[PDB]
Ligand binder design. Structure first.
Ligand code: A1LXR
Lengths: 55, 128, 338, 259, 233, 236
């Protein structure tokens, strides 16, 4: 069973050596993004007239 | 990650008393109608016990009826199987299993060759 | 004896957990603790693309936010107009057990796949009139869960073999195979730039995949049970897991860990499909107790419910324009909401 | 002849209340998509609307009876309420018979898909029933207008012939249910028996008593005991617009699940 | 996609003619199916129509109730009759398909249409500009045409098609619904419109870009055409 | 009205497609779909072969078409799928009458537990299993002409004392009938434990050479249709 538990193991050191940013550097990303496309997204801001699914 | 360590397993004589602890972590312990399954040499996986969500229902395979008792104290996130009246025929490695789907009353392929919610394993031996 | 390998592997895992722990300087609730809630979301089925016989698993918009392909368990890909209710095409499938469907971003092709382990490429905008197969991609040894088109040339399939694959249509053969998972993979989602993607499996752990060589770039592990659906957040730097343990969860690739879990006590059915709208301030989660839910993905409180389906919801996809969400469902009705 | 009946006001209002409640609820739950609206949904909906149109008129006859000569207030609207008391009361019978035939088909011949073809087939049968019946009973719009022949046509074709339909129909359903027993078969058998008994006890005495008044009473002489039997039996006959909403779609899990 | 008809020839002003069609190259029983004729040294005309699975059969105002466009899918032919043909409708015929779904392109492929000869109206018209405009290769032609009626339905799309003709082979679609190129057409052809006055912009005029740029609108059913601007080398 | 000439021809095309779809529905409604499960020990191949005689390298699902009395059955033998089944099993929630197959003479507790799971699965409720207990004759020689006793793997077989059998095939020695009924009863108990009324479990003692298996499904199978009809006609 080496030919496979071996596989799983160097996969983990592949996972290990990744410099991860503190989550606050994903706060800006995600939250600022959602702010960016907030006005346009027509399931949040009703489009009652401009859209082609009326009547 | 879903993780299931367990303790137990030894050289207990054919007729001895050995208790198999099983430690669960990473998933809410009580919603999963876990099992006890085992791999003996020269054969494939089989099934033993079916302790329910709350401890309400218990089932068994015939060969181990009247011999094994199953407790699952949600306080400790632990599953248990203590053994009485061993014969030198049930000398397999023990794999502490779990349901795929919570809030449910059936297990699918808990005796899968490649199930992913098992323990690493506990081996038990007898006769010496 | 050989236990050194297993011990050091479990140690690599024990250090991965602490490396992940050393990164969450705040929770995603906290950074959105001060933000305005989204309100309450009410959506009505503008159209109801009825016409499927049996239940529906698969539904992909065309990339014009107008065309819609749906796969049904009687073996029909019906391509809908979705502004009218008109049925643009109706393809008689071969294996009536289709689980996924696609629509090439150009629009010239649909690929259905299914439980026959074969990803079929039907061709719409032929110089001729009717649709007919272009290629049949047969290299998987287990049912196809999902399929996505990189372009008119590359398609990515997720199978039940714990494997995801990459194909070249005219050569009709794999370019690359992604082979990390341990349970069978159930949903696939190309990245917004199609450089990479993420596969949610039945291991309770989805994994990001870099489709240029075939290496699993990273591995998130947070769910209690197996994962039913994935979908990239439109920025590409996150994605959504709706698992069979009745939870949605949001992971982000660069922080390499769980951020926020969308939960509520009443839900005991698992997820079947998730999708963000366009801005990622709204996460549509398709459920299993006959009705979808709509989740404010940032602040995680439920905001808006869809309940118009007799049977469970199996497919759910916003438009690229963001002005519709179709919800196919085991009651055999598609429903376009707004 | 005697006509002095003090039970019609109270009984008619009670039937009105129960019928409007039941049939309004039935209509409000028959108009939703709900998972492949079947071929046999139009028949239940038609039974509901026929019963509802029937009972919409009953308070008018109540108002008649409270003040004796009262629907002189109708000012020539009396030959339309008289129709609606009969044009759709018989229509409910034919929709009930059609529903019985569909059930029979179902059970006894499930591998011959004849209780299908929806939303054309079904309705067009609805459409044929309504205009068919419509014409037939329009020979009423152009005290009473003496035509016994009209009664005979509404006796053999009105109730006798449809009665011999669902009687044989449900009997052949029953013989199958006799030879999983307990839950399904006991409950379905009891429901069939109750449906058949309530149909028999409501209409069949009403028509024969009607048909005997006619001849014997207002052409010659009669006895008031017969008048009492006629009026009470007619009151039961009007009551069928409350039982039919109950019987056909109370115990049905197929319906009771919609709610 | 080869569209070959039969019949055609010397026709008396009272002789019954069976101008059948035959088309054995495509999904025939899927397509809408018009007919168009060109008066020999003139513009070209709309004629009978039949939709997919004959349900909508519009007609011209010269054939309307005259000689009965028909169909036979299992033989893949457009059967016709005609008898009188008052010595002035005499022209060369064509066979055209047009598939009508969302995003489909109508009038993508036309035929040859044998050329029978005689032995002797609030519709729209396609108003055109100067018909010759002789130009040598390399220049940007912008030949135009105007419509009687405003061609912009509430759909949001402007209904104008665009064709050539050659000294020889059949006409052919350049762009459909005035903006979108055809299948076998170079990108140099283009279309720019406003709704009522609009044109196509050419860039490179090679030896096979010579011809007559007809026009046609699909908003009502006169299915109008223009006189046809004839570009010279 | 507010739609163009192409919009009219397009709604014509869509209606044409509806017509084709309703022809297909006429085909598809009158057909019965059976998912055929069972283990590698079960005669799962032999049931399919028998009903095929009654009527592609890595294919995920096979299927046999067959008809009994002018009724077309469409039985899906799941093919080269993986050992786990909790996700592709959900694709047969709309089938009629899962056929389940076990090996009587056998390691049987695995089959018992699997059928117990099939009974209790969401989306597998409302589907009435059909039992086919294969190796019936092999069970005859394993009990009457053999050594291994069902007492182990099944302690409550000594204290069974067979109920009043209606009319077992007279060739069966009483020990054989007792054990044979024991197996059926173990399956039925867990069938009746949780599935209140809408499941049914139809046991049957089938063999390698039992030529009645096609008819045996028609009957049962026809009776499942009848239960569905009784409920969805408000008649139950
Ligand atoms: C306020 C009430 C009175 C006070 C309370 C109630 C009564 C208290 C007083 C005493 C009794 C009343 C007076 C005597 C009784 C009435 C006078 C007789 C009048 C009479 O007999 N009847 C009417 C009822 O409509 C008429 O005959 C029936 C007309 C036919 C319409 C259906 C025929 C179906 C046709 C088509 C079929 C199938 C179609 C094709 C499929 C093959």
């Amino acid at each position: 069973s080496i030919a496979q538990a071996r596989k799983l193991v160097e996969q983990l050191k592949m996972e290990a050596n990744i410099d991860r940013i503190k989550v606050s550097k994903a706060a800006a990303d995600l939250m600022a993004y959602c702010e960016a496309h907030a006005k346009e997204d027509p399931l949040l801001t009703p489009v009652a007239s401009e859209n082609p699914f009326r009547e | 990650q879903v993780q299931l360590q367990e303790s137990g397993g030894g050289l207990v004589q054919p007729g001895g008393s050995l208790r198999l602890s099983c430690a669960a972590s990473g998933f809410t312990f009580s919603n999963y109608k876990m099992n006890w399954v085992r791999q003996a040499p020269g054969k494939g996986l089989e099934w033993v016990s079916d302790i329910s969500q709350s401890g309400a229902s218990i089932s068994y395979t015939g060969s181990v009826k009247g011999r094994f008792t199953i407790s699952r104290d949600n306080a400790k996130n632990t599953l248990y199987l203590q053994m009485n009246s061993l014969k030198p025929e049930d000398t397999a490695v023990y794999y502490c299993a779990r349901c795929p789907a919570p809030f449910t009353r059936d297990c699918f392929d808990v005796t899968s060759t490649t199930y992913a919610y098992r323990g690493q394993g506990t081996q038990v031996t007898v006769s010496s | 004896e050989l236990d050194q390998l297993r011990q050091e592997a479990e140690q690599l895992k024990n250090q991965i957990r602490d490396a992940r722990k050393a990164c969450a300087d705040a929770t995603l609730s906290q950074i959105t603790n001060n933000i305005d809630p989204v309100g309450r979301i009410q959506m009505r089925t503008r159209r109801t693309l009825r016409g499927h016989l049996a239940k529906i698993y698969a539904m992909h918009w065309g990339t014009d936010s107008r065309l819609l392909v749906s796969a049904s368990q009687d073996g029909k890909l019906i391509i809908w107009d979705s502004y009218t209710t008109n049925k643009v095409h109706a393809i008689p499938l071969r294996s009536s057990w289709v689980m996924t469907c696609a629509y090439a971003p150009s629009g010239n092709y649909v690929a259905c796949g299914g439980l026959d382990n074969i990803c079929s490429i039907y061709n719409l905008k032929t110089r001729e009139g009717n649709v007919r197969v272009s290629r049949e991609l047969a290299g998987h040894t287990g049912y196809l869960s999902c399929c996505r088109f990189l372009d008119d040339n590359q398609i990515v399939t997720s199978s039940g073999d714990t494997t995801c694959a990459l194909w070249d249509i005219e050569t009709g053969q794999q370019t690359t195979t992604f082979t990390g998972h341990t349970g069978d993979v159930m949903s696939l989602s190309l990245a917004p730039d199609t450089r990479l993607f993420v596969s949610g499996a039945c291991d309770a752990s989805a994994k990001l995949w870099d489709v240029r060589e075939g290496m699993c770039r990273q591995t998130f592990t947070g769910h209690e049970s197996d994962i039913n659906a994935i979908c990239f957040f439109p920025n590409g730097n996150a994605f959504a897991t709706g698992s069979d343990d009745a939870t949605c969860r949001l992971f982000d690739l660069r922080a390499d860990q769980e951020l926020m879990t969308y939960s509520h006590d009443n839900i005991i059915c698992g997820i079947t499909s998730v999708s963000f709208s366009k801005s990622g301030r709204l996460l549509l989660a398709g459920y299993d107790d006959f009705n979808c839910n709509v989740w404010d993905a940032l602040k995680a409180d439920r905001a808006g419910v869809l309940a118009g389906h007799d049977n469970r919801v199996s497919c759910l996809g916003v438009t690229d324009d963001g002005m519709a969400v179709a919800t196919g469902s085991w009651d055999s009705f598609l429903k376009i909401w707004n | 002849e005697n006509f002095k009946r003090e039970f019609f006001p109270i009984v008619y209002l009670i039937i009105f209340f129960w019928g409007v409640l039941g049939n309004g609820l039935s209509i409000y739950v028959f108009l939703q998509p709900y998972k492949k609206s079947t071929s046999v949904n139009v028949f239940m909906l038609n039974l509901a609307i026929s019963d509802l149109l029937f009972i919409s008129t009953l308070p008018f006859r109540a108002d008649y009876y409270l003040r004796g000569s009262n629907w002189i207030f109708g000012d020539l609207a009396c030959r339309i309420m008289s129709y609606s008391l009969y044009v759709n009361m018989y229509s409910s019978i034919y929709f009930l018979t059609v529903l019985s035939v569909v059930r029979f088909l179902a059970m006894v011949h499930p591998f011959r898909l004849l209780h299908v073809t929806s939303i054309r087939s079904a309705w067009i049968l609805c459409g044929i029933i309504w205009i068919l019946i419509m014409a037939s009973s329009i020979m009423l719009l152009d005290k009473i207008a003496k035509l016994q022949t009209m009664n005979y046509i509404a006796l053999v074709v009105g109730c006798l012939l449809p009665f011999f339909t669902l009687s044989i129909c449900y009997l052949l359903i029953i013989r199958v249910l006799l030879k999983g027993l307990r839950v399904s078969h006991r409950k379905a058998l009891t429901t069939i028996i109750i449906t058949l008994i309530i149909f028999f006890l409501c209409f069949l005495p009403y028509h024969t008593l009607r048909t005997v008044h006619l001849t014997t009473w207002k052409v010659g002489l009669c006895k008031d005991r017969l008048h009492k039997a006629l009026v009470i039996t007619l009151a039961l006959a009007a009551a069928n617009a409350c039982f039919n909403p109950l019987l056909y779609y109370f115990a049905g899990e197929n319906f009771k699940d919609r709610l | 996609v080869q569209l070959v008809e039969s019949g055609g020839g010397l026709v008396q002003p009272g002789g019954s003619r069976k101008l059948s069609c035959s088309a054995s190259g495509f999904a025939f029983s899927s397509f809408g199916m018009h007919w168009v004729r060109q008066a020999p040294e003139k513009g070209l005309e709309w004629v009978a129509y039949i939709s997919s699975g004959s349900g909508t059969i519009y007609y011209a105002d010269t054939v309307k109730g005259r000689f009965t466009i028909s169909r036979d899918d299992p033989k893949n032919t457009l059967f016709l009759q005609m008898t009188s043909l008052r010595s002035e409708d005499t022209a060369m015929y064509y066979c055209v398909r047009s598939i009508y779904y969302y995003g489909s392109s109508p009038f993508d492929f036309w035929g040859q249409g044998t050329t029978l000869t005689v032995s002797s109206s609030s519709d729209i018209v396609m108003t055109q500009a100067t018909s010759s405009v002789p130009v040598t290769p390399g220049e940007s032609v912008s030949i135009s045409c105007r419509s009687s009626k405003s061609l912009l339905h509430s759909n949001g799309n402007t209904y104008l098609y665009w064709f050539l003709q050659r000294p020889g082979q059949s006409p052919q679609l350049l762009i459909y619904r005035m903006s979108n190129l055809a299948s076998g057409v170079p990108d140099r052809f283009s279309g720019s419109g406003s709704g009522t006055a609009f044109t196509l912009t050419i860039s490179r005029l090679e030896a096979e870009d010579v011809g007559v740029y007809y026009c046609m609108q699909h908003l009502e059913y006169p299915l109008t055409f223009g006189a046809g601007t004839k570009l010279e080398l | 009205c507010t739609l163009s000439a192409e919009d009219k021809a397009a709604v014509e095309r869509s209606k044409m497609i509806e017509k084709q779809l309703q022809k297909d529905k006429q085909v598809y409604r009158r057909t019965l779909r059976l998912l055929l499960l069972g283990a590698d020990n079960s005669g799962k191949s032999t049931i399919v072969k028998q009903m095929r005689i009654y009527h592609v390298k890595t294919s995920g699902i096979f299927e046999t078409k067959f008809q009994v009395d002018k009724v077309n059955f469409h039985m899906f033998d799941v093919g080269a799928q993986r050992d786990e089944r909790r996700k592709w099993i959900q694709c047969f929630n709309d089938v009629t009458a899962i056929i389940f197959v076990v090996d009587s003479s056998d390691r049987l507790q695995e089959a018992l537990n699997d059928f117990k799971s099939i009974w209790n699965n969401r989306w597998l409720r409302t589907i009435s299993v059909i039992l086919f207990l294969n190796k019936q004759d092999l069970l005859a020689e394993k009990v009457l002409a053999g050594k291994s006793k069902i007492e182990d793997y099944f302690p409550e077989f000594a204290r069974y004392t067979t109920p009043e059998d209606a009319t077992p095939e007279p060739g069966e020695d009483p020990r054989v009938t007792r054990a044979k009924y024991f197996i059926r009863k173990e399956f039925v108990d867990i069938s009746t434990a949780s599935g209140d009324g809408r499941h049914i479990c139809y046991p049957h003692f089938t063999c390698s050479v039992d030529t009645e298996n096609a008819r045996r499904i028609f009957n049962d199978c026809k009776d499942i249709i009848l239960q569905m009809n009784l409920r969805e006609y408000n008649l139950v």
